[PDB]
From a paper:
In order to unravel the molecular basis of the substrate and product specificity of NTMT2, we determine the X-ray crystal structures of NTMT2 in binary complex with SAM, as well as in ternary complex with SAH and an RCC1-derived peptide (SPKRIA). In addition, NTMT2 contains two auxiliary regions: an N-terminal α-lid (η1, α1–α2), and a β-lid (β6–β7) inserted between β5 and α8. These two lids cover the core domain that contributes to the substrate recognition. We also identify that N89 serves as a gatekeeper residue to control the entry of substrate into the active pocket.
To determine the molecular basis of different product specificities between NTMT2 and NTMT1, we solved crystal structures of the NTMT2-SAM binary complex and the NTMT2-SAH-SPKRIA peptide  ternary complex. Despite that an unmethylated peptide was used for crystallization, a methylated α-amino group in the N-terminus of the peptide was traced in the crystal structure. Our ternary complex structure shows that, like in NTMT1, the substrate peptide is deeply inserted into the binding pocket through hydrophilic and hydrophobic interactions, and the α-amine of the first residue (S1) points towards the sulfur atom of SAH. The substrate residue P2 is sandwiched by the aromatic side chains of W191 and F90. The ε-amine of substrate K3 interacts with two aspartates in both NTMT1 and NTMT2 structures. In NTMT2, the main-chain N and O atoms of K3 are involved in a water-mediated hydrogen bond with the side chain of N223 and a direct hydrogen bond with the main chain of I270, respectively. Substrate residues downstream of the S-P-K motif protrude from the pocket on the surface of NTMT2, indicating that they are not essential for the recognition. Indeed, the fourth residue R4 is not involved in direct interaction and the main chain of the fifth residue I5 is accommodated by Q268. The NTMT2-SAM binary complex subtly differs from the NTMT2-SAH-SPKRIA ternary complex in that the turn of the β-lid of the ternary complex is shifted closer to the catalytic core, which facilitates hydrogen bonding between substrate K3 and both D232 and D235 of NTMT2.
Author numbering:
A (entry chain E): 1 to 5
B (entry chain A): 57 to 278
Write the structure that this text describes.
Amino acid sequence: SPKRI
Amino acid sequence: GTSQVINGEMQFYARAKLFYQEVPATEEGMMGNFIELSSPDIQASQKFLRKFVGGPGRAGTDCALDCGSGIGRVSKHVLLPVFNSVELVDMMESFLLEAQNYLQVKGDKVESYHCYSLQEFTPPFRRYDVIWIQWVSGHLTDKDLLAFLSRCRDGLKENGIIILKDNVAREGCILDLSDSSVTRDMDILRSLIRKSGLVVLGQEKQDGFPEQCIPVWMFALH
Ligand SMILES: Nc1ncnc2c1ncn2[C@@H]1O[C@H](CSCC[C@H](N)C(=O)O)[C@@H](O)[C@H]1O
């Protein structure tokens, strides 16, 4: 998934 | 005693399985904390894919492989509208079972559901026009990613390509203990691609994502 950072 | 828990590789893979055992088999589950980014992700993938398929010297459109598919979000939204058939590979039987429901509208165009960890998977020889690898490369160790990319090259039909899409760190390689994944920097990722024997045909940074997110990149490889 996307991540922050 | 501690001989298994201190095997970092073994724990890296084991902890990732334990994470996905508790992820719902839904688009939100696939997207983690970022379901609102599925739409810009898809649009960017559509725009990138179309530059490398169709017509002279460019990849065909008969068959694609969706690696680390989960329930098949990329297959539904990106691949199936372009390819005559697709196959999925994922380590989670749970997700591949749900994929049969999620992809039902085109269920007859999903030729196989391959339940394997990628580090144990050999893409069928010269079967695919495109092999799509999204948000799973960070779940392989460097040695396993290198070897998997090399095997993927042998999964390609003439003029076929691999499309890799993932998070790319500013510097280093950064472990996320929560889902047991790493984020690689550009230099490290490009080095692994090179060492696998692949060459970069094109690349593009994902637009429309929050400034706080790790950058996301697409690469077309062969
Ligand atoms: N070592 C491994 N081998 C195969 N699949 C793996 C894996 N590690 C993680 N996965 C799978 O990688 C997926 C990450 S979630 C992203 C799913 C999909 N690529 C999408 O873009 O929507 C999950 O389905 C998970 O089960």
